[PDB]
Design a binder for this molecule. Structure first.
Ligand SMILES: COc1ccc(-c2sc(NC(=O)C3CCCC3)nc2C)cc1S(O)(O)Nc1ccc(O)cc1
Ligand SMILES: Nc1nc2c(ncn2[C@@H]2O[C@H](COP(=O)(O)OP(=O)(O)O)[C@@H](O)[C@H]2O)c(=O)[nH]1
Lengths: 464, 155
């Protein structure tokens, strides 16, 4: 029995546990693994929750029942976990509807808060300008603070908490589109555990909306807040889109963390920033936005400069250390996000979907049109890197190889993420029958390091 | 020489690893991956040497010469414990009235998947006056003990 020697082994982790549960038609094996789930860290299984809950819905009933017990155990433990189970189960169904209705059968205040948010963005469809949308929103959110605090929390947050106050003056509609997404700031109170503590107490000049760093907006907002004296207090930011499908976004989130862990383990100096996604339904969702970063478009627009111009002004001369650091961050983040766009086949890449942060990193956003779905290095970027024959540009091409090489060494973990999700998906990114083929094939496991180096060079050329 | 030759049966719903209980007790091997079969190993009881003949299935010739009955129910599947009444009937109809019945709760390693109460299933043993024990072929917990008692209690 080599197999049991494997499961009993230290080699057995949450990843491989799901891998066997995904293939084995052995009911004796399925039931064994469904037991080992309880023996994992609650955090580690969490990352693969979308995977597990997707196998539950769109696979043999002999697999869903093996996962069901562990789910209901955690649903019973964490109110938050219970919530995100319901959300996922509904957004990916098109089976576990019975369980979903069980989860919702406590979460009343939270679901009220979500609906209220989603409804707010709906009514902004009439007001056709960006500015008109914001004015209604700010008054629309001012109504929210009339039933706060409440047993409400932002799942996007990395800690337990209650929502005490929402500074309506600070929120802003992000575009003029029919179902535009608004960004809101939320004051919360951190705690030991949500399940244990009951809602906080209530207590009833500033309120000016500017474009500034995160550290400062946190200060002006707290000063004007009644809850601005508790050491508990902390500010959160969430993007609320009431009409965009975030499932492909979530998928790309997992893929990004996974590439990130690989490069961090393989000790490859690459830099990417995945943003916390949340799936309310197939219709809607929320994003935990990257503060202190804006699109290259909104950067080139406000200052009317070239990217290289902005860098030198904001950081310093080529010779200043603060520029070298800012340039080094641009290269690393640029190189990593190339491989991310390559391996995922990310499309619709313009300076509107690419943020720029205070340190100098770049952060791609909006991950529709990946892989199958569909309807480059500009000179501006290459200039920031010192030019085609600058040493810092070789360093950019160098990181991709090292990055891609380390990606090959762990191709197994990455592909698993996508392959499972494709199961029973009417999603656009799984249009072609063989999508996973191109995905796997894009790693080029067959290639040598030398041939791998040639492919990187050839690919950088086609980039331009 | 071996003193006596016992014949005990392994009955119950398919999937409860009674063929694995059989393997672990005699050959000491367990396989996660999956006709009528029997196998025997001898043990020393009360200063005696006994070749316990464990039978296994996947009809009356089965219960012919049956000395002790091993009712194996899965703890992770409540329906298996439910069919014990249907398995007693099969025993009541075909099995020797003298045979000693020991209720077996296998797959006890599945602690987090327990569907059958350890205390309750032990209560059904008293209502029927039969010995009870929960076992696990994957870690060999209470495996040799089950036959050690059934073969000992067969006298
Ligand atoms: C899935 O789509 C998004 C993905 C990421 C973000 C942001 S936004 C931000 N901070 C910011 O400050 C904003 C960045 C540019 C505007 C300010 N950090 C993050 C992670 C926002 C959105 S979206 O609103 O739903 N659509 C959108 C598309 C293109 C845009 O040109 C602006 C918004
Ligand atoms: N986890 C676990 N699985 C077991 C145990 N005992 C048996 N199994 C599994 O249960 C499955 C069915 O057992 P099987 O050999 O078919 O017994 P049968 O129904 O009497 O033929 C096998 O694949 C075993 O791996 C146990 O103690 N723990």
């Amino acid at each position: 029995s080599w197999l049991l020697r494997l499961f009993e082994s230290k080699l057995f982790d949450i990843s491989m546990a799901i891998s066997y549960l995904y293939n084995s038609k052995e009911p004796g094996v399925q039931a064994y693994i469904g037991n080992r789930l309880f023996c994992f860290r609650n955090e580690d299984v969490d990352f693969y929750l979308p995977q597990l809950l997707n196998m539950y819905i769109h696979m043999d009933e002999d697999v869903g029942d093996a996962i069901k017990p562990y789910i209901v155990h955690r649903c019973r433990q964490s109110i938050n976990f219970s919530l995100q189970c319901a959300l996922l189960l509904g957004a990916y169904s098109s089976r576990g509807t019975k369980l979903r209705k069980l989860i919702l059968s406590r979460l009343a205040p939270e679901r009220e808060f979500i609906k209220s948010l989603m409804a707010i963005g709906k009514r902004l469809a009439t007001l056709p300008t960006k500015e008109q949308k914001t004015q209604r929103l700010i008054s629309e959110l001012s109504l929210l603070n009339h039933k706060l605090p409440a047993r409400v929390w932002l799942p996007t947050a990395g800690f337990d908490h209650h929502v005490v106050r929402v500074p309506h003056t600070q929120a802003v509609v992000l575009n003029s589109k029919d179902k535009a997404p608004y960004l809101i700031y939320v004051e919360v109170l951190e705690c030991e555990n949500f399940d244990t503590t009951s809602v906080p107490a209530r207590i009833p000049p500033s309120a000016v909306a500017l474009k500034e760093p995160w550290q400062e907006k946190v200060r002006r907002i707290r000063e004007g807040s009644p809850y601005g004296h508790l050491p508990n207090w902390r500010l959160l930011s969430v993007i609320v889109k009431c009409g965009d499908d975030l499932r492909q976004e979530l998928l790309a989130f997992q893929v990004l963390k996974q590439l990130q862990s690989i490069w961090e383990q393989e000790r490859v100096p690459l830099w990417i920033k995945p943003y916390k996604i949340l799936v309310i339904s197939a219709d809607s969702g929320m994003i935990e936005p990257v503060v202190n970063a804006v699109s290259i478009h909104q950067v080139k627009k406000q200052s009317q400069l070239s990217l290289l111009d902005y860098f030198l002004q904001e950081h310093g001369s080529y010779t200043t250390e603060a520029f070298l650091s800012a340039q080094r961050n641009f290269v690393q983040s640029c190189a990593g996000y190339c491989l991310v766009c390559y391996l995922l086949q990310v499309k619709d890449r313009h300076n509107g979907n690419i943020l720029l942060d205070a340190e100098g990193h770049i952060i791609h956003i909006d991950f529709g049109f990946i892989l199958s779905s569909s309807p480059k290095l500009t000179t501006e970027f290459v200039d920031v890197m010192g030019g085609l024959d600058g040493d810092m540009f070789n360093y950019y091409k160098m990181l991709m190889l090292q990055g891609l090489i380390a990606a090959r060494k762990h191709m197994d973990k990455v592909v698993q993420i996508v392959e499972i999700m494709q199961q029973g998906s009417q999603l656009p990114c799984f249009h072609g029958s063989s999508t996973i083929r191109n995905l796997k094939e894009r790693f080029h496991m067959s290639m040598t390091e030398e041939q791998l180096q040639l492919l990187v060079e050839q690919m950088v050329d086609g980039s331009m | 020489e071996y003193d006596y030759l016992f014949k005990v049966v392994l009955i119950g719903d398919s999937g409860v690893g009674k063929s694995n209980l059989l393997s672990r007790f005699t050959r000491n091997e367990f396989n996660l991956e999956s006709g009528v079969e029997f196998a025997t190993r001898s043990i020393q009881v009360d200063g005696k040497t006994i070749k316990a003949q464990i039978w296994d299935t996947a009809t009356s010739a089965y219960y012919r010469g049956a000395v002790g009955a091993l009712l194996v129910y899965d703890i992770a599947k409540h329906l298996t414990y439910e069919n014990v009444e249907r398995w007693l009937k099969e025993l009541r109809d075909h099995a020797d009235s003298n045979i000693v019945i020991m209720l077996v709760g296998n797959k006890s390693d599945l602690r987090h998947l327990r569907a059958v109460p350890t205390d309750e299933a032990r209560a059904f043993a008293e209502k029927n006056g039969l010995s009870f024990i929960e076992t696990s072929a994957l870690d060999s917990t209470n495996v040799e003990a089950a036959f050690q008692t059934i073969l000992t209690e067969i006298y």
